Amino acid sequence: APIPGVMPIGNYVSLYVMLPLGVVNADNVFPDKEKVEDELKQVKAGGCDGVMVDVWWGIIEAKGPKQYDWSAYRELFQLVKKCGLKIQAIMSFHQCGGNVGDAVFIPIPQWILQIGDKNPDIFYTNRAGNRNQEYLSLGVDNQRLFQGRTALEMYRDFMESFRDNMADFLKAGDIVDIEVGCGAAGELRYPSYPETQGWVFPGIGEFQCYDKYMVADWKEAVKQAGNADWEMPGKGAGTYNDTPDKTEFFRPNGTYKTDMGKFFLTWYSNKLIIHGDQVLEEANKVFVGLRVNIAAKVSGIHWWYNHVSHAAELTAGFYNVAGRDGYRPIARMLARHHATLNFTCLEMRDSEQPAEAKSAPQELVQQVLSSGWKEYIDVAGENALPRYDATAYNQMLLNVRPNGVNLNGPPKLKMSGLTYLRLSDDLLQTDNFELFKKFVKKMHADLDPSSPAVLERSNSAITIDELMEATKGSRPFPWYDVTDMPVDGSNPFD
Numbered sequence: 001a002p003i004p005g006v007m008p009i010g011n012y013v014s015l016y017v018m019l020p021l022g023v024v025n026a027d028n029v030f031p032d033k034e035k036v037e038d039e040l041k042q043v044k045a046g047g048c049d050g051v052m053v054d055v056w057w058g059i060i061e062a063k064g065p066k067q068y069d070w071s072a073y074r075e076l077f078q079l080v081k082k083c084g085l086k087i088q089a090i091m092s093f094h095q096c097g098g099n100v101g102d103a104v105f106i107p108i109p110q111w112i113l114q115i116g117d118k119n120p121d122i123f124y125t126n127r128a129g130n131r132n133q134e135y136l137s138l139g140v141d142n143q144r145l146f147q148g149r150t151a152l153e154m155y156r157d158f159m160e161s162f163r164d165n166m167a168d169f170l171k172a173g174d175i176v177d178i179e180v181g182c183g184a185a186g187e188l189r190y191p192s193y194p195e196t197q198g199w200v201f202p203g204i205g206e207f208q209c210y211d212k213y214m215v216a217d218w219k220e221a222v223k224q225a226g227n228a229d230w231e232m233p234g235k236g237a238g239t240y241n242d243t244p245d246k247t248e249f250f251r252p253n254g255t256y257k258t259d260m261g262k263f264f265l266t267w268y269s270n271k272l273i274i275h276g277d278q279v280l281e282e283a284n285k286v287f288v289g290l291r292v293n294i295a296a297k298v299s300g301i302h303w304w305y306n307h308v309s310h311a312a313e314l315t316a317g318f319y320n321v322a323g324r325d326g327y328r329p330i331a332r333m334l335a336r337h338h339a340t341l342n343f344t345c346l347e348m349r350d351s352e353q354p355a356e357a358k359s360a361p362q363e364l365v366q367q368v369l370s371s372g373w374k375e376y377i378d379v380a381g382e383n384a385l386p387r388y389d390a391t392a393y394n395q396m397l398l399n400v401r402p403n404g405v406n407l408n409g410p411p412k413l414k415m416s417g418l419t420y421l422r423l424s425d426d427l428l429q430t431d432n433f434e435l436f437k438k439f440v441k442k443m444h445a446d447l448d449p450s451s452p453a454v455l456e457r458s459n460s461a462i463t464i465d466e467l468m469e470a471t472k473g474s475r476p477f478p479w480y481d482v483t484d485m486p487v488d489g490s491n492p493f494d
């Protein structure tokens with residue numbers, strides 16, 4: 001039996017904090033060096049293991065193609081090192097903010113947006129013809145439109161430049177994770193719930209497959225399945241803020257359940273997966289044989305999960321319904337590249353959401369973490385919304401270790417890390433920040449604060465039908481109903 005008081009170190013979960021947005025501003029200038037420096041001293045003294053920061057494409061490659069300026073990020077990194085903190089870098093090929101109620105606006109490079117003025121089908125496009133500038137459509141991954149480059153090649157070249165200009169932080173072990181942005185907000189999904197077009201929680205969202213590049217691919221696919229005349233969904237899909245039952249496409253027994261609907265949803269979600277696969281392949285080509293994790297971010301679309309149609313997951317690109325697991329195919333694709341699944345909605349409870357939203361974040365988390373662990377990959381996480389209270393910290397604590405601590409060794413089920421949203425003035429406010437220091441100590445399983453594996457070369461390409469073998473629905477791992485280590489110091493199993 002174990003010795004009383006001895007906690008095996010395998011129980012430890014690393015805790016990272018997200019830096020403020022704009023910490024390197026749109027001009028490629030790192031301001032408030034002295035203030036930022038003191039926030040980092042506090043974070044380090046709170047016990048955090050590191051921080052996460054966006055590496056914005058539209059800052060670094062702003063001036064033109066292959067004109068990369070890393071100087072400001074090099075400074076920021078040197079500082080984070082000197083404060084004793086690890087670094088998670090997001091390859092952020094997307095836009096930050098740009099609204100009225102927004103800290104900062106960092107678009108993708110200006111010269112890419114020029115191309116878009118004359119050719120707006122480089123952007124994900126809804127049924128009505130609206131273009132979202134946040135991210136380049138997967139439609140354009142392999143289209144040589146960008147001053148003689150394709151979109152995948154721009155992502156490779158930027159990553160190569162990052163590796164080569166950060167080779168010392170990388171060999172020192174200062175950078176531990178590269179999150180590869182695969183979409184809006186850096187997430188592998190379609191922009192189906194865009195605030196810029198009127199979306200409001202808990203709308204069903206809308207499909208984003210109507211750019212001419214993606215429509216060409218569709219016309220071809222649908223012909224080869226023996227039905228030339230099958231259109232992408234129309235008015236039957238409804239619009240962003242509909243309810244499933246008010247549509248033909250998502251109502252019980254709606255179009256989503258017909259042969260046409262399945263075919264379309266299979267294609268739509270397969271394109272997302274293929275995009276993820278091609279982007280992480282470049283990442284793996286670049287970072288092979290370095291001691292660094294690569295990661296992709298998956299959004300938690302928890303609204304309408306208790307509806308049969310799972311409508312908001314579907315518009316987002318996750319073809320997850322009864323008897324079809326939509327997350328396990330993605331985890332399998334990730335496993336081919338030895339990458340980590342970062343799930344970005346860990347803190348929520350079902351009882352905190354309105355009943356008409358048919359929302360099930362707890363069950364959603366359990367499905368995705370389970371499916372990731374079953375494909376032999378690591379799963380890290382983040383909170384979706386800023387939260388300062390005990391209930392939220394205890395729910396994150398449950399999810400990082402869903403069967404609690406193991407006094408005989410590494411736990412059965414453990415998350416690889418948690419990145420907290422966000423470093424801010426509200427977080428450093430004395431009371432808030434005292435609770436946060438208890439949460440970190442609990443994340444560390446009452447050990448004191450303290451490396452990744454060498455990244456293997458991507459395994460063999462999995463063909464599309466071997467990936468569909470992964471949609472076989474299965475039972476998820478059993479979860480505890482409360483944490484082992486709540487923030488109040490107590491133990492619910494005396």
Ligand SMILES: OC[C@H]1O[C@H](O[C@H]2[C@H](O)[C@@H](O)[C@@H](O[C@H]3[C@H](O)[C@@H](O)[C@@H](O[C@H]4[C@H](O)[C@@H](O)[C@@H](O)O[C@@H]4CO)O[C@@H]3CO)O[C@@H]2CO)[C@H](O)[C@@H](O)[C@@H]1O
Pocket residue numbers: 018053054090092094095096097185186187201297298299300301302343344345382383384385421
């Ligand atoms: O949109 C608000 C409503 O939707 C919420 O849904 C969330 C998902 O549930 C989350 O899984 C979330 O992802 C977050 C995530 O915490 C983080 O990646 C965040 O901050 C980003 C920034 O936006 C981005 O530009 C990038 O640079 O990195 C930042 C971190 O440095 O981005 C997401 C938030 O934009 O995904 C959606 C939103 O994408 C929520 O569940 C609903 O309850 C809420 O009403």
